[PDB]
Structures are given as structure tokens and as C-alpha cells.
């Protein structure tokens, strides 16, 4: 989450291959079993593979058996997951986790990464268009005011909207629309503070290496 850091997630053609990495920062893998687990856009949380401390034992879910290979390097403090014969439903956020190290049997997964996103599809990476949502010029102003950003036509998932850097935010989950995602984000703020004060949504789409600002101006 801070301790473990996944990387390598990417868009990949069906039938293709990909290799994820997981690095410890501030903790050692030496001595511990480890697992990869994934969350798909929605089946339920899925365990997919584990490997022993020394590496001579590993086990896989049926779902990935034969396609995926778990491996590790305790010297470099790194865990890996080689993926091959990738299919549509391998699309997921992949987490690595270190098992607790108690004696007397097996252990739960106590340290988890933030995850890395993998998409398996023949569609192409596309950055978002970002449109401001501001009240119409005829709106009867109230005590507070709700503003938003419409983030349209991007691929793959996901994006992160950040309002004025660092609450009153709502994040509407993205919906797939003719091969492309759309989502939106709102923020509500007192009428006394906007438009007198600057409001800005910053939208990051890591996959396309893109950040789009929008300064909310009054209609």
C-alpha cells in the first residue's frame, strides 16, 4: 500500500503475454510466503497464486494454472507474475501480498500493495476529453453550489480526478459506451467560495500518459 508496490500493468492483445513485478519498499520478502490476488471489474476478489519463501513450491488457481507463472527474487526483494495466453477475463487489478510469518502452519495475507491494472482487449488506448459541469446562467443560486467534470471517451480504465489538489466529492463509476468509458466527478462547495474562488478538476489517465485540467468558469 506503501510497503509493496506493483508495476507492469498494461493493455494487452488477447492471446498475448505480460510480466508484473512487485517490489518491497521498507520490508523484506525473505522468510515469507507470498501471493498474487486480483479484482476483476466484477467477479468477486480472486486469489490466483502463491509461492514459498525458497521458491520450490508454488500453487495456482485453476483459472490461471498453466498460463501464469509466479516467481521471486529475495535478493532483489521482488515478486513476479508471468502471464501468457491472456484472455478478456484476465482484465483486473492485480495485488501482491506478503503472508504473515507465524510458525505453526499457514498464514493470512497482512501486507498488500495498491495494485496494478491489466486490461486484455483489442481496443486502443485513448485519452479522455474533460468537460466542465457548471450551473446554467439561469440557475436560482442557493446556499451552496455543485460543480462537476464529465470525463468522456477514454480507454482503458482508469482515471483519477483531483479537485484543487486535496472531501465533498462524488465519483460516479465509469460506464462502457461504444468501446469507450465515461465517468464524472462532482464537488459541492458554498456559493460564497465559487466563482469568487478558483475551482479546478485535474484528470489523470496514466495509460495515455495524460493529465487534463479544467478550470470551472461560471456559465
Amino acid at each position: 500500500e506503501v510497503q509493496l508496490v506493483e508495476s507492469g500493468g498494461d493493455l494487452v492483445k488477447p492471446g498475448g503475454s505480460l510480466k508484473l513485478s512487485c517490489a518491497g519498499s521498507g520490508i523484506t520478502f525473505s522468510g515469507y510466503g507470498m501471493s498474487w490476488v486480483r479484482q476483476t471489474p466484477d467477479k468477486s476478489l480472486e486469489w490466483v497464486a502463491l509461492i514459498s519463501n525458497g521458491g520450490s513450491y508454488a500453487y495456482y488457481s485453476d483459472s490461471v494454472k498453466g498460463r501464469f507463472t509466479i516467481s521471486r527474487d529475495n535478493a532483489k526483494n521482488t515478486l513476479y507474475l508471468q502471464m501468457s495466453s491472456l484472455r478478456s477475463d484476465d482484465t483486473a487489478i492485480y495485488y501482491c501480498a506478503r503472508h504473515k510469518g507465524l510458525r505453526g502452519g499457514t498464514n493470512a495475507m497482512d501486507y498488500w500493495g495498491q495494485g496494478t491494472s491489466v486490461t486484455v482487449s483489442s481496443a486502443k488506448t485513448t485519452p479522455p476529453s474533460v468537460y466542465p459541469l457548471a450551473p446554467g446562467c439561469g440557475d436560482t443560486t442557493g446556499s451552496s453550489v455543485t460543480l462537476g467534470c464529465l470525463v468522456k471517451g477514454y480507454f482503458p480504465e482508469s482515471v483519477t480526478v483531483t479537485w484543487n489538489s486535496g472531501s465533498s466529492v462524488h465519483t460516479f463509476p465509469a460506464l462502457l459506451q461504444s468501446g469507450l468509458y465515461t465517468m464524472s466527478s462532482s464537488v459541492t462547495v458554498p456559493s460564497s467560495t465559487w466563482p469568487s474562488e478558483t475551482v479546478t478538476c485535474s484528470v489523470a489517465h496514466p495509460a495515455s500518459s495524460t493529465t487534463v485540467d479544467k478550470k470551472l468558469e461560471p456559465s
Binding site: 476478489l45 502452519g105 498464514n107 459541469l133 446554467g136 439561469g138
Partner: protein
């Protein structure tokens, strides 16, 4: 392969009350003088978090509101008292045998007092229009329960097509839901009309909550 069956799949619990979640294993998960059933919490947009290891041990920093019990093939996670921030999916996992398959998960919803939605309507931005498109967006905010209906009108006439709706995950602070309804038009059709209407119908009342704008003045 040990199969884990969680029950219930869904439950709604009021603040201050007890949530009881069961996980049943197809074969015993006990050996070595211990019981290898583990419980995790997953909130939207976060990695899973360990709550309870080896049936009954609280992970450090997890509050004692969470409690694990059971043995052999029958286990229970009890959250008592439930707090707003407990909205999550809860998973069991056993490690007595590989594969360490999770249960299907139990989604915990916070029950709270019925609430009517706040409606905001937004015309397409100049920028979108200049680019050939037009999306009209309505937010229906902070309502409970989740079920809600929206209808759109263009100059008083109901519009079916072009509508997509997306609900938020229950808010971890006020236990409400929100949802966006977006009407997608071509610029040329948008520009041929005056008044746009978003009508929310929520079980909290017979009368819709209506918001509108007109293109014809300012």
C-alpha cells in the same frame, strides 16, 4: 479443493447494530492446534485489508468491534457495533489447503433513514458543443435507499434513448447513494430545443423532484 460459502451475500445493518457474516468450508480448515480461516475487508478503490487471522486473532490496529469465531467448517465474522465506515465487502479465505480460494464475499450495506435526493442539472459545456457533441447531465445526490428512477424531457416531451445512469458506492460518511444520469445528444439536436428537464422519482415521495434549464434567455 476446499470451497467456501459465505452467507448472506448481502445484508443491511443499522448503525450501532450487529452484523453477523458466516463462512462455511467444504472440509475442515483446522490443523496444528489452529484454525486457518482468515477475514478481509475490501472498500471500493482500495486493496483488501486483513481483519482477522487464524479464525479469532485481531490484526494489529483493527478495532475490537470486529470479532472472529468458529472452528472446523463453520466460521463467523461479527461486526458489533457497525459504524458508517464499515461499508465494504467482506471475504473469508482458508489456508489449511491450497488452493486458497476466497469465499464469494458478503456486501455490507448500512441501513439508515429514508432520504429524498437533491437534483442538479447541467447543460453541455461550450467546449463540448464546439466539438460536435452535447451531453446533458443530472446529479441525483444523497438519497436512501438505492432504488431511484429518472426521466428526461426536452420541451416537455419524454426522451427514452441516449440515457445512461451510474450509481455511486454507498458513502462511508452519511451512508447515502448518489447517481448521475447523462443524456447524450448530437449538438444539432440539442440546439434545436429550449427547455431541458431532469425528473427524479424516489420512493420517498409520489411527487418527482424536478430541475430544468432553458436555452432561450441568458
Amino acid at each position: 479443493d476446499i470451497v467456501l460459502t459465505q452467507s448472506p451475500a448481502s445484508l443491511a445493518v443499522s448503525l450501532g447494530q450487529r452484523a453477523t457474516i458466516f463462512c462455511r468450508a467444504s472440509e475442515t480448515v483446522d490443523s496444528y492446534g489452529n484454525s486457518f480461516m482468515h477475514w478481509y475487508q475490501q472498500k471500493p478503490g482500495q486493496p483488501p485489508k486483513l481483519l482477522i487471522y487464524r479464525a479469532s486473532n485481531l490484526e494489529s490496529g483493527i478495532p475490537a468491534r470486529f470479532s472472529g469465531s468458529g472452528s472446523r467448517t463453520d466460521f463467523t465474522l461479527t461486526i458489533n457495533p457497525v459504524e458508517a465506515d464499515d461499508v465494504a465487502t467482506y471475504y473469508c479465505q482458508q489456508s489449511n489447503e491450497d488452493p486458497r480460494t476466497f469465499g464469494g464475499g458478503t456486501k455490507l450495506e448500512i441501513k439508515r433513514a429514508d432520504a429524498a435526493p437533491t437534483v442538479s442539472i447541467f447543460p453541455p459545456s461550450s467546449e463540448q458543443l464546439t466539438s460536435g457533441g452535447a451531453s446533458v447531465v443530472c446529479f441525483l445526490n444523497n438519497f436512501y435507499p438505492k432504488d431511484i428512477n429518472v426521466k428526461w424531457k426536452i420541451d416537455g416531451s419524454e426522451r427514452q434513448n441516449g440515457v445512461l445512469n451510474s450509481w455511486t458506492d454507498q458513502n462511508s460518511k452519511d451512508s447515502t447513494y448518489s447517481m448521475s444520469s447523462t443524456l447524450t445528444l448530437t449538438k444539432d439536436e440539442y440546439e434545436r430545443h429550449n427547455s431541458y428537464t431532469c425528473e427524479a422519482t424516489h420512493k420517498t415521495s409520489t411527487s418527482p423532484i424536478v430541475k430544468s434549464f432553458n436555452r432561450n434567455e441568458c
